[PDB]
Amino acid sequence: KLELRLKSPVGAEPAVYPWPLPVYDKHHDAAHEIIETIRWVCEEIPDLKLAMENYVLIDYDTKSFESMQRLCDKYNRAIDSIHQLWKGTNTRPSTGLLRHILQQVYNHSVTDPEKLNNYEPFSPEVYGETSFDLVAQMIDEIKMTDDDLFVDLGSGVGQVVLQVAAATNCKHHYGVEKADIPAKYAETMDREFRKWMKWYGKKHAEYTLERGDFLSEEWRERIANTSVIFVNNFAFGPEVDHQLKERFANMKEGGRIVSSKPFAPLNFRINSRNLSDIGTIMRVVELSPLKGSVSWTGKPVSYYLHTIDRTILENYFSSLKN
Amino acid sequence: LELRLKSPVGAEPAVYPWPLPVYDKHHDAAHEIIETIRWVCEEIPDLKLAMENYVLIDYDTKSFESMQRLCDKYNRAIDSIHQLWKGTNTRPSTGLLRHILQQVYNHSVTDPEKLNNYEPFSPEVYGETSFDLVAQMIDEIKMTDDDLFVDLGSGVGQVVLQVAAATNCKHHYGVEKADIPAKYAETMDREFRKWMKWYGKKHAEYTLERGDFLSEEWRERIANTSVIFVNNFAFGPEVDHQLKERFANMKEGGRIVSSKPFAPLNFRINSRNLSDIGTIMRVVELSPLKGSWTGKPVSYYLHTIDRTILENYFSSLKNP
Numbered sequence: 190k191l192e193l194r195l196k197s198p199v200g201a202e203p204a205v206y207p208w209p210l211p212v213y214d215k216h217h218d219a220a221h222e223i224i225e226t227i228r229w230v231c232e233e234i235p236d237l238k239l240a241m242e243n244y245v246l247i248d249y250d251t252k253s254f255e256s257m258q259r260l261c262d263k264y265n266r267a268i269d270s271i272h273q274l275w276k277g278t279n280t281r282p283s284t285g286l287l288r289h290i291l292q293q294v295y296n297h298s299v300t301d302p303e304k305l306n307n308y309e310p311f312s313p314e315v316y317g318e319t320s321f322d323l324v325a326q327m328i329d330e331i332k333m334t335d336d337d338l339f340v341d342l343g344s345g346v347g348q349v350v351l352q353v354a355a356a357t358n359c360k361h362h363y364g365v366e367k368a369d370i371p372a373k374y375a376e377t378m379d380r381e382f383r384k385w386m387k388w389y390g391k392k393h394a395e396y397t398l399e400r401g402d403f404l405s406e407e408w409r410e411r412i413a414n415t416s417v418i419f420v421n422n423f424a425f426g427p428e429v430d431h432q433l434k435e436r437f438a439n440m441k442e443g444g445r446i447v448s449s450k451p452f453a454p455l456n457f458r459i460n461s462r463n464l465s466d467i468g469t470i471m472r473v474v475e476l477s478p479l480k481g482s483v484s485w486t487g488k489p490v491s492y493y494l495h496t497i498d499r500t501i502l503e504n505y506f507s508s509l510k511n
Numbered sequence: 512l513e514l515r516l517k518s519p520v521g522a523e524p525a526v527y528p529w530p531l532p533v534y535d536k537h538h539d540a541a542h543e544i545i546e547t548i549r550w551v552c553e554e555i556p557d558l559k560l561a562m563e564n565y566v567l568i569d570y571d572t573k574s575f576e577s578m579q580r581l582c583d584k585y586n587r588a589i590d591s592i593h594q595l596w597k598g599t600n601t602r603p604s605t606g607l608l609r610h611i612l613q614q615v616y617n618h619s620v621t622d623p624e625k626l627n628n629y630e631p632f633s634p635e636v637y638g639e640t641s642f643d644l645v646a647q648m649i650d651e652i653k654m655t656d657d658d659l660f661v662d663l664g665s666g667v668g669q670v671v672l673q674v675a676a677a678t679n680c681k682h683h684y685g686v687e688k689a690d691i692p693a694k695y696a697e698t699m700d701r702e703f704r705k706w707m708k709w710y711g712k713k714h715a716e717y718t719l720e721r722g723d724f725l726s727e728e729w730r731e732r733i734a735n736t737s738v739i740f741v742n743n744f745a746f747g748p749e750v751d752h753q754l755k756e757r758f759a760n761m762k763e764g765g766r767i768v769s770s771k772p773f774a775p776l777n778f779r780i781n782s783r784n785l786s787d788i789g790t791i792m793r794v795v796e797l798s799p800l801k802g803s804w805t806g807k808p809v810s811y812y813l814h815t816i817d818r819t820i821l822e823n824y825f826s827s828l829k830n831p
C-alpha cells in the first residue's frame with residue numbers, strides 16, 4: 190500500500206519503492222530517480238512518450254504521496270497501452286542510460302558510504318563526476334573484441350567492470366578487490382546491476398566480481414593470460430608497483446595496461462643501465478580527452494596506455510651484437 | 512606557511528595558506544592547485560613544453576615540501592615563458608570556465624549549510640547538471656550586444672557569472688532577496704573578477720544585487736529586459752501570478768527561460784482564456800536529449816513575447 194511501483198518496459202518484475210521515499214544525499218533522492226527513470230524509458234521508447242499524458246512530468250510534487258502515485262500511474266498505464274500495441278503488432282544501453290543505470294545501482298547498493306573509508310577522488314561515491322566519462326572515453330579509444338579478456342585490478346565496488354561489461358563484447362570482464370567492505374558492496378552492485386539491466390531490457394557481456402589479492406600466485410597466471418588490464422595505481426606504494434611490473438612482464442605481446450599513473454617513463458630510452466626496467470618491453474602513451482577532436486569540457490585528466498612490445502629489447506640486443 | 516601560483520598574464524599571484532583548505536569529503540585546494548596548473552598548461556602550449564613532466568605525476572597533497580616543489584616547478588616554467596615572450600584578452604573555453612566557477616564557489620561559500628537549500632538547483636551542486644544546461648541555453652538563445660540579461664532570484668550568482676563570461680550582452684543582472692545567498696554573491700563577484708584577471712580572461716559587464724524582483728523598481732526593469740532567466744520550480748501561485756503580470760509588460764521578442772512553463776505548451780486561444788499569459792507568448796520545451804548529451808534527462812522552457820497570438824484571434828473573429 191505505502192509504496193510506488195514502476196512497470197518494466199519489457200515485462201520484468203516492477204520496480205517497487207517504499208513511501209516515504211529514500212534519500213541518497215543532501216540534494217539526491219529516490220523521487221528524482223523515479224522521474225529520471227520514467228524520462229529515460231520515454232526517451233528511448235517513442236510510442237511510450239506518445240501514449241503517456243506528459244503534463245504530470247511538469248506538474249509533480251515529490252513531497253506528496255498522491256502526486257508521485259499519479260505520476261507512476263500515468264507511466265504504468267502508458268506501459269500497458271504499449272504492451273497492448275506490441276501484442277497487436279535487447280540491445281546495449283546508450284551512454285546516457287548507462288550513466289543513469291550505474292547511479293541507480295550504486296544508490297540501491299551502497300546504503301552506508303561512510304563504511305568505504307575512501308576520501309580520494311577515485312572514491313565510488315563520486316564515480317559519476319569524472320570517472321564514468323573517462324571510462325567511456327577509454328572504451329572508445331581502446332578497441333576491445335570478443336578475443337579480449339578484461340581485468341580491473343582493485344575493482345572497489347565494481348563500477349568500472351559494470352560499465353565496461355555493458356559497453357563491450359570482451360569474452361569476460363573481471364574485477365578483483367581485496368578490502369572487505371567494497372568486496373561486500375560489490376556483491377550487491379552485481380545483483381542490482383543484473384536486475385536493473387533486465388528491468389530496462391538491456392544487454393551486457395559476462396562479468397565476475399570477486400574478492401581476492403591480485404598479488405597472489407593464482408592471480409600471477411591470470412594476469413599473464415589477460416589481454417586488457419585496468420588499474421588505478423595512483424596511490425600504490427613502491428612494493429606493489431614493483432610486484433605489478435613483475436606480473437605485467439609475463440603478459441603476451443600486444444597485451445595492454447590502462448592506468449592512472451604510468452608504469453614506465455613516457456620518454457624511456459633503453460641503455461646498459463636500465464635493461465631491468467619494464468620500459469624495455471612496453472610502449473607507453475598518455476591519453477587525454479583534452480587532446481584530439483574530443484569535445485571534452487570536464488576535468489583536465491589523463492590516463493596511460495601501456496602495450497607489451499618486446500621489439501624494444503630485441504632491437505637493442507641486435508645493436509649490441511652488431 | 513603558504514603556497515603561491517604565478518599568474519600566466521602577470522596578475523597578483525594566487526596565495527594559498529598551509530594546511531590547505533578542505534572543501535568536502537573528496538575535494539580540497541590541493542586538487543584545485545593541480546587542476547589550475549593543468550588548465551594553464553593546456554591552454555599555453557609553450558608552458559607544457561618548458562615544465563618538467565614528472566612533477567604532475569609524483570606529488571603528495573599531504574606534504575608541504577612536495578606541494579611547494581610542484582608550485583615552484585610551475586612558477587619557474589611561467590618565468591621561462593615570460594622571458595620567451597619578452598624576447599619576442601579572450602573569453603574562457605567552456606572547460607576552463609567550469610574550473611573557474613567551481614574555484615570561485617570554493618573560495619566564497621565557506622559554510623554551505625547556511626544556504627538552507629536541499630533542492631537539485633542548489634549552488635552546492637551547480638557543476639553537476641546546471642552548468643551544462645546553462646551552456647546549452649547560451650548556445651540556443653544566441654544573445655547579442657543589444658540584449659539585457661536578468662536572472663530573477665540569482666542565488667549566489669552562478670548563472671550570471673557563467674552567462675557574463677560567455678556572451679556579449681550589454682549587461683547581465685542578478686537579483687536575489689534572501690540574505691545568506693545575497694551576502695555570498697558579494698564574495699562570488701569579487702572572487703570571479705580576481706580569478707578571471709588571474710587567468711587573463713574577458714567577461715561582459717554584470718551586477719549582482721540584493722533586492723525583491725516583485726518591487727515597483729523591478730516592474731519597469733523587467734519590462735525593459737530582453738532575456739529573463741528564472742528558476743520558478745518552487746514558486747507559489749502568488750509569485751507566479753505576479754511574475755506573469757511583470758512579463759505582460761515586456762517588449763515583442765522578449766524571452767523568458769525557466770524551469771517550469773508559465774503557460775501551457777499546447778495553449779489554444781478561445782473566448783474563455785483571453786486573460787491568460789498564453790495569449791501573448793509562445794512556449795517551447797528545450798531538451799538537450801532532442802536534436803551529444805549523455806547527462807540527466809532534463810528540460811527547460813523558452814517563452815517568447817508575441818502579441819500576434821492575441822491579434823490573430825481578434826482578426827479571425829472579424830474575418831471569418
Ligand SMILES: CCC#CCN(c1ccc2nccc(N)c2c1)c1c(Cl)cccc1Cl
Binds near residue numbers: 311319324421449
Ligand atoms: C578508479 C575509477 C576510475 C576511473 C577512470 N580513470 C581515471 C583516470 C584518471 C583520473 N584522474 C582524476 C580523476 C579521476 N576520476 C580519474 C579517473 C582511469 C582510467 Cl580511464 C584508466 C585507468 C585507470 C583509471 Cl583510474
Ligand SMILES: CCC#CCN(c1ccc2nccc(N)c2c1)c1c(Cl)cccc1Cl
Binds near residue numbers: 640642644648809
Ligand atoms: C538554478 C541553477 C540552474 C540552472 C539551469 N537550469 C535548469 C533547468 C532544469 C533543471 N532540471 C533538473 C536539474 C537541474 N540542475 C536543472 C537546471 C535552468 C535553465 Cl537552463 C534555464 C532556466 C531556468 C533553469 Cl533552473
Ligand SMILES: Nc1ncnc2c1ncn2[C@@H]1O[C@H](CO)[C@@H](O)[C@H]1O
Binds near residue numbers: 343365368371
Ligand atoms: N593486493 C590487492 N588485491 C586486490 N585489491 C587491492 C589490492 N591492493 C589494493 N587493492 C585495492 O585497489 C584499489 C585501488 O586501486 C582499492 O579499492 C584497494 O582496496
Ligand SMILES: Nc1ncnc2c1ncn2[C@@H]1O[C@H](CO)[C@@H](O)[C@H]1O
Binds near residue numbers: 687689692723724
Ligand atoms: N521576490 C523575490 N525577489 C528576489 N529573489 C527571490 C524572490 N523570491 C524568491 N527569490 C529567490 O529565488 C531563488 C529561487 O530560485 C531563491 O534564491 C530565492 O531566494
